[PDB]
Coordinates of C-alpha atoms and ligand atoms in Angstrom, one line a residue:
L1 CA 2.2 -31.4 -29.0
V2 CA 0.8 -27.8 -29.4
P3 CA 0.8 -27.1 -33.1
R4 CA 2.2 -24.1 -34.9
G5 CA 0.0 -21.0 -35.0
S6 CA -2.2 -21.9 -32.1
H7 CA -3.2 -19.4 -29.4
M8 CA -4.3 -20.0 -25.9
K9 CA -7.5 -18.6 -24.3
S10 CA -6.8 -16.3 -21.3
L11 CA -8.6 -17.0 -18.0
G12 CA -10.8 -14.6 -16.1
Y13 CA -10.2 -13.7 -12.4
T14 CA -11.9 -14.6 -9.2
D15 CA -11.3 -13.3 -5.7
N16 CA -10.2 -15.4 -2.7
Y17 CA -8.1 -13.4 -0.2
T18 CA -6.8 -16.5 1.6
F19 CA -4.2 -17.1 -1.1
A20 CA -1.1 -15.0 -1.0
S21 CA 1.1 -14.5 -4.1
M22 CA 3.0 -17.5 -5.2
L23 CA 6.7 -17.1 -6.2
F24 CA 8.3 -19.1 -9.0
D25 CA 12.1 -19.0 -8.4
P26 CA 13.9 -20.7 -11.3
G27 CA 17.6 -21.1 -12.1
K28 CA 19.1 -18.8 -14.6
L29 CA 19.7 -19.8 -18.2
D30 CA 22.9 -17.6 -18.6
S31 CA 25.8 -20.1 -18.7
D32 CA 27.1 -22.8 -21.0
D33 CA 26.8 -25.2 -18.0
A34 CA 23.1 -24.2 -17.6
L35 CA 22.6 -24.3 -21.4
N36 CA 24.1 -27.8 -21.7
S37 CA 21.6 -29.3 -19.2
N38 CA 18.2 -30.6 -20.2
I39 CA 16.8 -29.4 -16.8
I40 CA 15.6 -26.0 -15.7
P41 CA 15.6 -26.1 -11.9
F42 CA 13.3 -24.1 -9.7
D43 CA 11.9 -23.6 -6.2
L44 CA 8.3 -22.6 -5.6
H45 CA 7.5 -20.4 -2.6
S46 CA 4.1 -19.5 -1.1
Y47 CA 2.3 -18.3 2.0
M48 CA -0.8 -20.3 3.1
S49 CA -3.2 -19.9 6.0
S50 CA -8.6 -28.6 2.3
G51 CA -9.7 -30.4 -0.9
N52 CA -8.5 -30.4 -4.5
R53 CA -10.5 -27.4 -5.6
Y54 CA -7.5 -25.1 -5.8
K55 CA -4.6 -26.0 -8.1
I56 CA -1.1 -24.6 -8.8
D57 CA -0.7 -23.7 -12.4
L58 CA 2.7 -23.1 -14.1
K59 CA 2.6 -21.6 -17.6
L60 CA 5.8 -21.6 -19.7
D61 CA 6.9 -19.7 -22.7
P62 CA 6.2 -21.7 -25.9
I63 CA 9.9 -21.9 -26.8
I64 CA 10.3 -23.9 -23.5
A65 CA 6.8 -25.5 -23.4
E66 CA 7.3 -27.2 -26.8
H67 CA 10.1 -29.4 -25.4
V68 CA 8.9 -30.2 -21.8
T69 CA 8.7 -33.9 -21.0
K70 CA 8.1 -33.7 -17.3
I71 CA 7.7 -31.1 -14.5
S72 CA 7.9 -32.1 -10.8
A73 CA 8.9 -30.7 -7.4
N74 CA 9.1 -31.9 -3.8
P75 CA 6.2 -30.7 -1.6
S76 CA 7.3 -28.5 1.3
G77 CA 8.9 -30.6 4.0
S78 CA 9.2 -33.7 1.8
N79 CA 11.8 -35.3 -0.4
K80 CA 9.4 -37.2 -2.7
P81 CA 8.5 -35.5 -6.0
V82 CA 5.0 -34.8 -7.2
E83 CA 4.4 -34.5 -10.9
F84 CA 2.6 -31.7 -12.7
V85 CA 0.1 -32.6 -15.4
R86 CA -0.2 -30.6 -18.6
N87 CA -3.6 -28.9 -18.8
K88 CA -6.0 -29.2 -21.7
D89 CA -8.5 -26.4 -22.6
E90 CA -12.3 -26.4 -22.6
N91 CA -12.0 -29.1 -25.3
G92 CA -9.1 -31.5 -25.8
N93 CA -6.3 -29.1 -27.0
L94 CA -3.1 -29.0 -25.0
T95 CA -2.1 -25.8 -23.3
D96 CA 1.3 -24.6 -22.2
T97 CA 0.2 -24.7 -18.5
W98 CA 1.0 -27.5 -16.1
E99 CA -1.1 -28.2 -13.0
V100 CA -0.6 -29.7 -9.6
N101 CA -2.7 -29.7 -6.4
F102 CA -2.0 -26.9 -4.0
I103 CA -2.4 -28.7 -0.6
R104 CA 0.3 -31.2 0.2
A105 CA -2.1 -33.4 2.1
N106 CA -4.2 -33.7 -1.1
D107 CA -1.1 -34.8 -3.1
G108 CA -0.1 -31.2 -3.6
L109 CA 2.8 -29.0 -2.9
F110 CA 2.2 -26.8 0.2
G111 CA 1.5 -27.5 3.9
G112 CA 2.1 -30.5 6.2
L113 CA 0.1 -17.2 7.0
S114 CA 2.9 -19.7 7.1
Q115 CA 5.8 -19.9 4.6
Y116 CA 6.4 -23.0 2.5
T117 CA 8.9 -23.8 -0.2
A118 CA 8.6 -26.6 -2.6
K119 CA 12.1 -27.5 -3.5
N120 CA 14.0 -29.5 -6.1
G121 CA 11.7 -28.4 -8.9
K122 CA 12.7 -29.7 -12.3
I123 CA 11.5 -28.8 -15.7
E124 CA 12.7 -31.7 -17.8
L125 CA 13.2 -31.1 -21.5
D126 CA 13.6 -33.4 -24.6
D127 CA 16.8 -31.5 -25.6
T128 CA 19.3 -29.2 -24.0
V129 CA 18.3 -25.7 -23.0
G130 CA 21.0 -24.3 -25.3
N131 CA 19.7 -26.1 -28.4
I132 CA 16.1 -25.1 -27.5
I133 CA 16.7 -21.4 -27.0
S134 CA 19.0 -21.1 -30.0
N135 CA 15.8 -21.4 -32.0
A136 CA 14.4 -18.1 -30.8
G137 CA 14.6 -14.5 -31.8
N138 CA 16.1 -11.5 -30.0
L139 CA 15.9 -12.6 -26.4
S140 CA 16.6 -9.0 -25.4
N141 CA 13.1 -8.1 -26.8
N142 CA 11.1 -11.3 -26.6
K143 CA 11.8 -12.8 -23.2
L144 CA 11.2 -16.4 -22.1
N145 CA 8.1 -15.7 -20.0
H146 CA 6.7 -17.6 -17.1
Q147 CA 3.6 -17.2 -15.0
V148 CA 2.4 -19.0 -11.9
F149 CA -1.0 -18.8 -10.1
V150 CA -3.6 -20.7 -8.2
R151 CA -6.5 -21.8 -10.3
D152 CA -10.1 -22.2 -8.9
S153 CA -10.9 -25.4 -10.7
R154 CA -14.6 -25.0 -10.0
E155 CA -14.7 -21.7 -11.8
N156 CA -11.7 -22.0 -14.2
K157 CA -10.5 -18.6 -12.9
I158 CA -7.3 -17.2 -11.6
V159 CA -7.3 -16.3 -7.9
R160 CA -6.3 -12.7 -8.3
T161 CA -4.0 -12.4 -5.3
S162 CA -2.1 -15.6 -6.1
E163 CA -0.7 -14.4 -9.5
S164 CA 2.9 -13.9 -10.2
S165 CA 4.9 -13.7 -13.4
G166 CA 8.4 -13.0 -14.8
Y167 CA 10.9 -14.2 -17.3
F168 CA 14.0 -16.5 -17.3
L169 CA 17.3 -14.7 -17.3
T170 CA 19.6 -15.4 -20.3
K171 CA 22.8 -13.9 -21.5
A172 CA 20.7 -11.3 -23.2
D173 CA 19.7 -9.9 -19.8
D174 CA 23.3 -8.8 -19.3
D175 CA 22.6 -6.0 -16.8
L176 CA 20.5 -8.2 -14.5
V177 CA 23.0 -11.0 -14.8
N178 CA 25.8 -8.7 -13.7
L179 CA 23.7 -7.7 -10.7
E180 CA 23.0 -11.3 -9.7
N181 CA 26.8 -11.8 -9.9
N182 CA 27.7 -8.8 -7.7
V183 CA 25.5 -9.4 -4.6
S184 CA 26.0 -7.0 -1.7
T185 CA 27.3 -8.2 1.7
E186 CA 24.6 -6.1 3.4
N187 CA 21.8 -8.1 4.9
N188 CA 22.8 -11.0 2.8
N189 CA 20.5 -13.5 4.5
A190 CA 17.5 -11.1 4.9
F191 CA 15.4 -12.1 1.8
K192 CA 14.4 -15.4 0.4
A193 CA 13.0 -14.7 -3.1
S194 CA 11.3 -12.0 -5.2
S195 CA 8.8 -12.0 -8.0
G196 CA 6.5 -9.5 -9.6
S197 CA 3.0 -9.2 -11.1
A198 CA 1.8 -6.8 -13.7
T199 CA -1.9 -6.1 -14.1
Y200 CA -4.4 -3.6 -15.7
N201 CA -6.6 -1.4 -13.5
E202 CA -9.3 0.7 -15.1
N203 CA -9.7 2.9 -12.0
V204 CA -6.2 4.4 -12.3
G205 CA -6.3 8.0 -13.6
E206 CA -8.6 8.9 -16.4
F207 CA -7.5 6.2 -18.9
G208 CA -6.7 3.3 -16.5
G209 CA -3.3 2.1 -15.5
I210 CA -0.8 -0.7 -15.2
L211 CA 0.2 -1.9 -11.7
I212 CA 3.6 -3.5 -11.3
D213 CA 3.7 -5.1 -7.9
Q214 CA 6.9 -6.7 -6.5
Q215 CA 6.9 -9.0 -3.5
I216 CA 10.1 -9.8 -1.6
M217 CA 9.7 -12.7 0.8
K218 CA 11.8 -12.6 4.0
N219 CA 13.9 -15.3 5.5
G220 CA 13.2 -13.9 9.0
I221 CA 12.2 -10.6 10.6
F222 CA 14.4 -8.2 8.6
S223 CA 14.4 -4.6 9.8
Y224 CA 15.6 -1.8 7.5
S225 CA 17.6 1.0 9.2
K226 CA 20.7 2.7 7.6
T227 CA 22.6 5.8 8.1
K228 CA 21.8 8.5 5.5
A229 CA 25.0 7.7 3.7
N230 CA 24.3 3.9 3.5
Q231 CA 20.7 4.2 2.3
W232 CA 19.6 1.7 -0.3
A233 CA 17.9 2.5 -3.6
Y234 CA 14.9 1.0 -5.4
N235 CA 15.5 0.3 -9.1
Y236 CA 12.9 -0.4 -11.7
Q237 CA 12.8 -1.3 -15.4
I238 CA 9.6 -0.4 -17.5
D239 CA 9.2 -2.1 -20.9
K240 CA 10.3 0.5 -23.5
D241 CA 7.3 -0.3 -25.7
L242 CA 4.9 1.0 -23.1
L243 CA 6.6 4.4 -23.0
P244 CA 4.4 6.0 -25.7
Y245 CA 1.3 5.2 -23.5
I246 CA 2.6 6.3 -20.1
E247 CA 1.6 9.8 -18.8
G248 CA 3.2 9.3 -15.4
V249 CA 5.0 6.8 -13.2
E250 CA 4.5 6.6 -9.4
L251 CA 5.6 4.7 -6.4
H252 CA 3.0 3.4 -4.0
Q253 CA 3.2 1.8 -0.6
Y254 CA 1.9 -1.7 -0.7
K255 CA -4.2 -5.2 -3.7
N256 CA -6.7 -2.6 -4.7
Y257 CA -5.5 0.7 -6.2
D258 CA -5.8 3.7 -3.9
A259 CA -4.2 7.0 -5.0
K260 CA -3.8 7.8 -1.2
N261 CA -1.0 5.1 -1.3
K262 CA 1.2 7.3 -3.5
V263 CA 4.6 8.1 -1.9
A264 CA 6.6 9.5 -4.8
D265 CA 6.7 10.4 -8.5
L266 CA 9.2 8.3 -10.4
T267 CA 11.3 9.2 -13.4
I268 CA 12.4 6.8 -16.2
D269 CA 15.0 7.2 -18.9
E270 CA 14.5 6.7 -22.6
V271 CA 14.7 2.9 -22.2
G272 CA 12.4 2.7 -19.2
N273 CA 14.9 2.5 -16.4
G274 CA 14.8 4.4 -13.2
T275 CA 16.0 4.5 -9.6
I276 CA 14.8 6.2 -6.4
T277 CA 16.4 6.7 -3.0
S278 CA 15.8 8.7 0.1
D279 CA 17.4 9.8 3.3
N280 CA 15.3 7.2 5.0
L281 CA 13.9 4.5 2.6
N282 CA 11.4 3.5 5.2
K283 CA 9.3 6.5 4.0
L284 CA 9.0 5.0 0.5
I285 CA 8.8 1.2 1.2
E286 CA 6.9 -0.7 3.9
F287 CA 9.6 -3.2 4.9
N288 CA 7.4 -4.5 7.8
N289 CA 10.3 -3.9 10.1
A290 CA 10.8 -6.7 12.7
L291 CA 7.9 -8.6 11.3
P292 CA 8.1 -11.7 9.1
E293 CA 5.6 -10.3 6.5
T294 CA 6.5 -10.2 2.8
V295 CA 7.7 -6.8 1.5
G296 CA 5.5 -5.3 -1.2
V297 CA 6.5 -2.5 -3.6
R298 CA 4.0 -1.0 -6.2
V299 CA 4.9 0.9 -9.3
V300 CA 1.9 2.6 -11.0
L301 CA 2.0 3.5 -14.8
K302 CA -0.8 6.0 -15.6
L303 CA -2.0 5.5 -19.1
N304 CA -2.4 8.6 -21.4
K305 CA -5.1 6.8 -23.6
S306 CA -7.2 3.7 -23.6
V307 CA -5.3 0.4 -22.9
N308 CA -7.0 -0.9 -26.1
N309 CA -4.8 1.4 -28.2
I310 CA -1.6 -0.5 -27.5
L311 CA -2.1 -3.7 -29.6
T312 CA -3.8 -1.5 -32.2
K313 CA -0.7 0.5 -32.7
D314 CA 0.0 0.8 -36.5
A315 CA -3.6 -0.4 -37.0
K316 CA -5.4 0.6 -40.2
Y317 CA -9.0 1.6 -40.5
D318 CA -11.3 1.4 -43.5
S319 CA -13.4 4.2 -45.2
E320 CA -16.0 4.1 -42.4
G321 CA -13.4 4.3 -39.7
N322 CA -13.7 0.6 -38.8
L323 CA -10.7 -1.4 -37.7
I324 CA -9.1 -3.6 -40.3
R325 CA -8.6 -6.7 -38.0
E326 CA -5.7 -7.9 -40.1
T327 CA -3.8 -4.8 -39.1
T328 CA -4.0 -5.3 -35.3
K329 CA -1.8 -7.4 -33.0
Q330 CA -3.4 -10.5 -31.4
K331 CA -1.0 -10.5 -28.5
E332 CA 1.9 -8.6 -26.9
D333 CA 4.0 -9.2 -23.9
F334 CA 5.7 -6.5 -21.8
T335 CA 8.3 -7.2 -19.2
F336 CA 9.4 -5.4 -16.1
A337 CA 12.1 -5.7 -13.3
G338 CA 12.7 -4.3 -9.8
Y339 CA 15.5 -4.7 -7.3
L340 CA 17.2 -3.1 -4.3
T341 CA 20.8 -2.0 -4.3
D342 CA 23.1 -0.9 -1.5
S343 CA 24.8 2.6 -1.5
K344 CA 27.5 1.2 -3.8
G345 CA 25.0 -0.2 -6.4
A346 CA 25.4 -3.8 -5.5
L347 CA 22.3 -6.0 -5.5
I348 CA 20.7 -6.8 -2.2
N349 CA 20.5 -10.6 -2.2
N350 CA 17.3 -12.1 -3.6
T351 CA 15.5 -8.7 -4.2
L352 CA 15.4 -8.9 -8.0
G353 CA 11.9 -9.6 -9.3
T354 CA 10.7 -9.6 -12.8
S355 CA 7.2 -9.6 -14.2
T356 CA 5.3 -10.0 -17.5
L357 CA 2.1 -8.2 -18.6
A358 CA 0.6 -10.5 -21.2
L359 CA -1.9 -8.4 -23.2
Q360 CA -4.2 -10.4 -25.6
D361 CA -6.9 -9.6 -28.2
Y362 CA -7.8 -13.1 -29.0
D363 CA -10.3 -12.2 -31.7
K364 CA -8.5 -9.1 -33.1
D365 CA -11.5 -6.8 -32.6
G366 CA -9.5 -4.1 -30.9
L367 CA -10.7 -4.8 -27.3
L368 CA -8.2 -6.6 -25.0
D369 CA -9.4 -9.9 -23.6
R370 CA -9.4 -8.5 -20.1
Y371 CA -11.2 -5.3 -21.2
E372 CA -14.0 -7.5 -22.8
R373 CA -14.2 -9.6 -19.7
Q374 CA -14.2 -6.8 -17.1
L375 CA -15.7 -3.7 -18.9
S376 CA -17.7 -4.3 -22.1
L377 CA -18.8 -7.9 -21.3
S378 CA -18.5 -8.7 -24.9
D379 CA -17.1 -12.1 -25.9
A380 CA -13.3 -12.1 -25.9
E381 CA -13.3 -15.0 -28.5
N382 CA -15.8 -13.5 -31.0
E383 CA -15.1 -10.3 -32.9
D384 CA -18.9 -9.8 -33.5
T385 CA -20.5 -11.0 -30.3
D386 CA -24.1 -10.0 -31.2
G387 CA -23.9 -11.1 -34.8
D388 CA -25.0 -7.8 -36.3
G389 CA -22.0 -7.3 -38.6
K390 CA -20.4 -4.5 -36.6
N391 CA -17.3 -5.7 -34.7
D392 CA -17.1 -5.3 -30.9
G393 CA -14.4 -2.6 -30.8
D394 CA -16.0 -0.7 -33.7
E395 CA -19.3 -0.7 -31.8
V396 CA -17.8 0.5 -28.5
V397 CA -15.6 3.1 -30.2
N398 CA -17.0 4.0 -33.6
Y399 CA -20.7 3.5 -33.6
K400 CA -21.1 4.0 -29.9
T401 CA -23.7 1.2 -29.9
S402 CA -23.9 -1.8 -27.7
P403 CA -21.8 -4.8 -28.9
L404 CA -24.3 -7.0 -27.0
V405 CA -27.4 -5.8 -28.9
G406 CA -27.9 -6.8 -32.6
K407 CA -30.2 -5.3 -35.2
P408 CA -33.9 -4.8 -34.3
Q409 CA -36.5 -6.4 -36.5
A410 CA -40.2 -5.4 -36.7
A411 CA -42.9 -6.7 -39.1
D412 CA -44.7 -4.1 -41.2
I413 CA -48.1 -3.0 -39.8
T414 CA -51.2 -1.1 -41.0
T415 CA -52.7 2.3 -40.1
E416 CA -55.3 0.3 -38.1
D417 CA -52.8 -1.6 -35.9
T418 CA -52.0 -0.4 -32.4
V419 CA -48.8 -2.5 -31.6
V420 CA -45.4 -2.7 -33.3
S421 CA -44.2 -6.3 -32.6
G422 CA -40.7 -7.6 -33.2
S423 CA -37.5 -8.8 -31.6
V424 CA -33.8 -7.9 -31.3
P425 CA -30.8 -10.2 -30.5
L426 CA -29.7 -9.6 -26.9
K427 CA -26.5 -11.2 -25.6
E428 CA -25.8 -12.4 -22.1
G429 CA -24.5 -9.2 -20.6
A430 CA -26.9 -6.8 -22.3
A431 CA -28.5 -4.1 -20.2
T432 CA -32.3 -3.5 -20.0
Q433 CA -33.3 -2.0 -23.4
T434 CA -36.1 0.4 -24.3
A435 CA -37.7 0.1 -27.7
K436 CA -39.0 3.3 -29.4
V437 CA -41.1 3.8 -32.5
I438 CA -40.1 7.1 -34.2
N439 CA -41.6 8.6 -37.3
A440 CA -39.7 10.0 -40.3
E441 CA -39.6 13.5 -38.8
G442 CA -38.0 12.2 -35.6
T443 CA -41.1 12.1 -33.3
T444 CA -41.3 9.2 -30.9
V445 CA -44.8 7.8 -31.1
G446 CA -44.4 4.8 -28.8
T447 CA -42.0 3.2 -26.3
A448 CA -41.8 0.0 -24.4
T449 CA -39.3 -2.2 -22.4
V450 CA -37.8 -5.0 -24.4
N451 CA -38.4 -8.4 -22.7
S452 CA -35.3 -10.4 -21.6
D453 CA -35.8 -12.8 -24.6
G454 CA -35.4 -9.9 -27.0
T455 CA -39.1 -9.6 -28.0
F456 CA -41.0 -6.3 -27.7
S457 CA -44.5 -4.9 -28.1
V458 CA -44.7 -1.1 -28.5
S459 CA -48.2 0.5 -28.1
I460 CA -48.8 3.2 -30.7
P461 CA -51.8 5.1 -32.0
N462 CA -53.4 4.3 -35.3
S463 CA -50.7 6.0 -37.1
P464 CA -50.1 7.7 -40.5
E465 CA -48.6 5.6 -43.3
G466 CA -44.9 5.9 -43.9
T467 CA -41.4 4.7 -42.9
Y468 CA -40.8 4.4 -39.2
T469 CA -37.7 3.6 -37.1
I470 CA -37.7 0.9 -34.4
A471 CA -34.9 2.0 -32.1
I472 CA -33.4 -0.1 -29.3
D473 CA -31.9 2.2 -26.6
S474 CA -29.3 0.9 -24.1
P475 CA -28.5 3.0 -21.0
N476 CA -24.7 2.4 -21.4
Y477 CA -24.3 3.6 -25.0
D478 CA -25.0 6.9 -26.7
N479 CA -26.6 5.5 -29.9
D480 CA -29.5 3.1 -30.5
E481 CA -29.6 0.0 -32.6
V482 CA -32.0 0.9 -35.4
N483 CA -34.0 -0.6 -38.3
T484 CA -36.9 0.7 -40.3
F485 CA -40.4 -0.8 -40.9
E486 CA -43.5 0.3 -42.8
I487 CA -46.9 1.4 -41.6
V488 CA -49.0 0.8 -44.7
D489 CA -52.5 1.6 -46.0
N490 CA -55.0 -0.5 -44.0
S491 CA -56.3 -2.0 -47.2
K492 CA -52.9 -3.8 -47.6
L493 CA -51.6 -7.0 -46.2
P494 CA -47.9 -6.9 -45.4
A495 CA -45.7 -9.9 -45.0
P496 CA -45.6 -11.3 -41.5
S497 CA -42.3 -12.1 -39.7
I498 CA -41.0 -15.0 -37.5
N499 CA -39.0 -14.5 -34.3
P500 CA -35.8 -16.5 -34.0
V501 CA -36.3 -20.1 -33.1
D502 CA -33.9 -22.6 -31.6
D503 CA -34.0 -26.4 -31.1
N504 CA -35.2 -26.0 -27.5
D505 CA -38.2 -23.9 -28.3
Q506 CA -41.7 -25.5 -28.3
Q507 CA -43.3 -22.5 -29.9
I508 CA -42.9 -20.2 -32.9
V509 CA -43.8 -16.6 -32.3
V510 CA -45.0 -14.7 -35.4
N511 CA -45.7 -11.0 -35.9
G512 CA -48.3 -9.6 -38.4
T513 CA -51.3 -7.4 -38.8
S514 CA -54.1 -7.9 -36.3
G515 CA -56.9 -10.2 -37.5
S516 CA -54.6 -11.8 -40.2
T517 CA -54.0 -15.6 -40.0
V518 CA -50.3 -16.5 -40.3
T519 CA -49.1 -19.9 -41.5
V520 CA -45.6 -21.2 -41.0
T521 CA -44.0 -23.7 -43.3
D522 CA -40.5 -25.2 -43.5
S523 CA -38.4 -25.6 -46.7
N524 CA -40.7 -28.6 -47.7
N525 CA -43.9 -26.5 -47.3
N526 CA -45.0 -28.7 -44.5
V527 CA -47.5 -26.6 -42.4
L528 CA -45.9 -26.6 -39.0
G529 CA -48.7 -24.4 -37.6
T530 CA -51.2 -21.6 -38.1
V531 CA -52.4 -18.8 -35.9
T532 CA -54.8 -15.9 -36.2
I533 CA -53.4 -12.7 -34.7
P534 CA -55.8 -11.3 -32.0
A535 CA -57.8 -8.1 -32.3
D536 CA -55.6 -5.7 -30.2
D537 CA -52.1 -7.1 -30.9
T538 CA -49.7 -7.8 -33.7
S539 CA -48.0 -11.0 -32.4
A540 CA -49.2 -14.5 -31.8
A541 CA -47.9 -18.0 -30.9
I542 CA -47.8 -21.3 -32.8
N543 CA -47.4 -24.5 -30.7
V544 CA -45.6 -27.6 -31.9
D545 CA -45.2 -31.0 -30.3
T546 CA -41.4 -31.5 -30.8
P547 CA -38.9 -28.7 -31.2
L548 CA -37.3 -28.2 -34.6
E549 CA -33.9 -29.5 -35.7
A550 CA -31.2 -26.9 -35.9
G551 CA -30.9 -25.8 -39.5
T552 CA -34.5 -26.1 -40.6
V553 CA -35.6 -23.0 -42.6
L554 CA -38.9 -21.3 -41.8
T555 CA -41.0 -18.9 -43.9
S556 CA -44.6 -17.6 -43.4
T557 CA -47.4 -15.9 -45.2
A558 CA -50.5 -14.1 -43.9
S559 CA -54.0 -14.0 -45.2
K560 CA -56.9 -11.7 -44.5
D561 CA -60.1 -10.5 -46.3
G562 CA -59.2 -12.6 -49.4
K563 CA -55.7 -11.2 -49.6
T564 CA -52.5 -13.3 -49.3
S565 CA -49.3 -11.6 -48.3
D566 CA -45.8 -12.0 -49.7
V567 CA -43.5 -14.5 -48.0
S568 CA -41.7 -13.4 -44.9
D569 CA -38.0 -13.3 -44.6
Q570 CA -36.7 -16.8 -43.9
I571 CA -35.6 -17.8 -40.4
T572 CA -33.2 -20.7 -39.7
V573 CA -33.5 -22.7 -36.5
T574 CA -30.3 -22.4 -34.5
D575 CA -28.5 -24.5 -31.9
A576 CA -30.0 -23.6 -28.4
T577 CA -26.6 -23.7 -26.8
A578 CA -24.5 -21.8 -29.4
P579 CA -24.0 -18.2 -28.3
Ligands
LIG601 CA1 8.2 -14.8 -25.1
LIG602 CA1 -11.0 -8.7 -28.4
LIG603 CA1 -14.9 -9.6 -28.9
LIG604 CA1 -21.8 -6.5 -33.3
LIG605 CA1 -24.7 -4.2 -31.7

């Protein structure tokens, strides 16, 4: 079982334009009959143009997933079921996603753009649906969500164009249930099924946007043409909780966003509902008249502020303006619906599509999972990716520093030294950094490019004694990561420093004044190595036979001209594959 209080990692996206959107078409959960069954039936529809690389993934609401004993469906053109297998994550924890091969010839669901339907789908449960969903909250506000997509099993990513979502209809969805129960006679066999997808697009407007794309698959070659008086209407429902974040709502003709595709401004009422019609609906919706191609409809929600502000609603901040992580939401689902009606308000058969936007802040740092993956490149499952003690959102928003660049470190030097040597933690997405040595009055006295491993060697003049700043400058952030170090009287012997060492490193890099000899010992004072720092540098290398075990603690002292320095700050060897 999936235990209480567990959360699922979201998946990144990959592109593969050969996969059309999949459409999960379940039975409704809105009757005593349906509620007294232990089966939720479904069909699965898709369009396809070899191998087991690409999988079909079905992800079910936890209320449902907790009770699932078996999921199966007949491949297209067959009457023999194939069974879905419950996925496990990057370790051995169960997810709420069930998986089956895509291609029927590879024991999958589709095949022998063509249209295929896998029929007789059955979600089998260990109790009745009614007993299961009677242990839920307000199903008007928290829906029973579903999502379907093709997963690239080589990359563990979602094929962007395959994704579809929605929610099961219950008695709580009374307006949509009444629509399903009052189907129009007009073009009653035109459409086979409909589903939606809701995504975030940073390129919409100035704050990004939400795209709500509905697909309506055809049974044949439907052609829309009505008199002015018999024109249909398009109807849409926008989750009321998004309304504080929406600047405008637009209809686009319809995967990339392009403002040139705008065909109307849309209005919504106080609960997020709207309707649009026309003297010729062909001007607003591309019905692909007399072609078999799926009808697409796009609704665009232009945000009025960063998408990262939604789950942080009601968030509190400390004295220094940093997010109190306990005050933000870790996830939030928003639901949407769209459908066509005839001129009397009756539902055009099979044109009702729902969708779910599943926003997540897995690590409660204020940056949505998908924002971290697509924009900042910070880790979506670590609230402090670089380890510097400033959390990712705070860094992007408050400090305006890179969340991929930790705190620089530089050993003290003397007035006779000509190089400031040190290092800084750089995380996998970090840009190319520039290190600067700046005196107390704000004058830059040296600059260099930080190497990819974080080390740097900044050339400086023989410089006046005092407190200096080592600043690490990213091109993507306004502010540098800073630390201070000392340039001391040249009769002094400052403590050296040790660069970070992991259990894959055969060498220990040390920094210290030129001509001093630096000796490194572990917690048991075993001399692991000694090196004299050369005449025109302030860093040197120690070589060891075998790398050090993760957890061993390192210190160092330097000696020169009869002086012995204080001990360096300790350095702990880390695991070479821990981020
Ligand atoms: Ca739910
Ligand atoms: Ca986050
Ligand atoms: Ca993070
Ligand atoms: Ca940080
Ligand atoms: Ca940082």
